[PDB]
Amino acid sequence: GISRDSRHKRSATGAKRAQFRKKRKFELGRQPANTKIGAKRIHSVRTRGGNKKYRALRIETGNFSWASEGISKKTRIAGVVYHPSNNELVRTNTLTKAAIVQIDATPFRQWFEAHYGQTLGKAERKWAARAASAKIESSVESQFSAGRLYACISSRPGQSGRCDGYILEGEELAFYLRRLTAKK
Amino acid sequence: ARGPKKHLKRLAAPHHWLLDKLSGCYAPRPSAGPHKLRESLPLIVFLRNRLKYALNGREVKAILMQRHVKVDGKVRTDTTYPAGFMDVITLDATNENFRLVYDVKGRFAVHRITDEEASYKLGKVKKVQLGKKGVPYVVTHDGRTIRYPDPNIKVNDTVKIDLASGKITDFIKFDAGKLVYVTGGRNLGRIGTIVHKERHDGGFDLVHIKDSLDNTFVTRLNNVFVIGEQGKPYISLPKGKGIKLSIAEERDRRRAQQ
């Protein structure tokens, strides 16, 4: 099948390498998962050593971490808006590491209200304690008014079968907004 | 080639086993186990070639399957079990124990020992690590892992292993002036005292050893086994005590019996 060997892929001098040692199983590759959105379907791949990988096809929900409050709520992926490696992945809504997605933002809304309760974008005195730390970035809170939070996929859905990620924040968030405004 | 090899051709076996060349095409391949392939002595070799109790491998298996032989306190009915350095092989019939130590020539010498010190064995600390749940442990040269080691035990130290509970009873530190066995290289089987340890970051550490006769040799840190202090080895040393007589004085010793 697909080989990851370097017996092909001619040497650095440009010389074409002669063949020996017909393709070996320990250097095989496999086909990309090409994870889609919605209607979860996870296939098990028996890998080397008896281990198991999870090709995630058509993933709907993933665990996304804010990393500013350390919450990591489970949410549903709206869609893909940016991909540094291939715009076609954005066009086909392919879920992949480092892909910029939109998450529902509703679990984060609920957690923020139940924890701090300060009308983010529209046991009694715990908010009195954690009120000074209730201010958040304008470019983060503005997304809640539309119900779509920008996030970056950090897991490998083709490898682990999960589509976990983190909410974009700070300089990373600003960078991806600038790219989105340039390409949209 | 497609998987692990199960055979060991003769002339490919370790030379220390002193196996006859024209006996068969194969040598006993040491099974996976505590010490190593090259650094071990299969029970079949120890029972047929070093002690001559069994005449062949069939009789070796007959010995082992009636639970006579015992390695490190456990029965070990495996014919090619890789008994290695400082293992205790006790036979209850012909009641006697041996400690697998290297003679001066580098072969695993037959070293008769008494029960009061066959009770334990020594182990060089291969590594010190934090196990799961934050539990420290020591990995010894014979593949033993012992939990909750003394927090002063570092790599290249030696630990006395109870061998009944498998715990640390005492521990010797790798330091200048401590007695060391050499467990590899050209000087395999030699006993001396550490003179200096050269660091060689990124490379291999070297150590200078002075035997009792003041012969000084340098060897890699990998094959130095601390066995105590000067004049006080924690184990019973073999007949030669690692002196490494030259061939001339060896001939003189041989011809002193006339």
């Binding site: - | 002339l11 095409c25 001339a248």
Partner: protein
């Protein structure tokens, strides 16, 4: 497969096949020591050349070198044990000066003659071949035996082999069986 079995040649043929002086000297040695062919002389010359080469390689080292001392005294030990070398001349430079007749003398076939066990060197060879000579408690039928200078005193006829033993032989038995009738009864 099993380990290979080492084997070596024990002789070396002369470079010049038809040297008249060498041929005459070889026939002289063969006649003097009852040798079957030139191959025995070739073998003795091969051993002597090996010994001389070893001695030269030892001498090329500085004296009191450990290897020179060890292998030298080993070589003199072996040579004086076989009898080829002289007790007086144990300095390895009188090993360099050895000759073929020194080895031809220490043969069992030569010693059986030199001890009076036989009436000719060829008679001695025949006696050894026909299982008549023992070294200790051991019949030896190999004419090239290299008596170890401790078996010289012990070379004697065998307990078997009815020349020093007690048996009546075979052709003597047949002769007696026919003479029983030949006498008239």
């Amino acid at each position: 497969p099993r380990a290979p079995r080492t084997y070596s040649k024990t002789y070396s043929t002369p470079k010049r096949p038809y040297e008249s002086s060498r041929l005459d000297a070889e026939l002289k040695l063969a006649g003097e020591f009852g040798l079957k062919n030139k191959k025995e002389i070739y073998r003795i010359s091969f051993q002597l050349s090996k010994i001389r080469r070893a001695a030269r390689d030892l001498l090329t080292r500085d004296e009191k070198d450990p290897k020179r001392l060890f292998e030298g005294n080993a070589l003199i030990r072996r040579l004086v044990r076989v009898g080829v070398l002289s007790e007086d001349k144990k300095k390895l430079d009188y090993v360099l000066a050895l000759k073929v007749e020194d080895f031809l003398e220490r043969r069992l076939q030569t010693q059986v003659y030199k001890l009076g066990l036989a009436k000719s060197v060829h008679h001695a060879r025949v006696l050894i071949t026909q299982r008549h000579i023992a070294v200790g408690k051991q019949i030896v039928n190999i004419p090239s035996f290299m008596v170890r200078l401790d078996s010289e005193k012990h070379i004697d006829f065998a307990p078997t082999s009815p020349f020093g033993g007690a048996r009546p032989g075979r052709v003597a038995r047949r002769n007696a069986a026919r003479k029983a009738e030949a006498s008239g009864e």
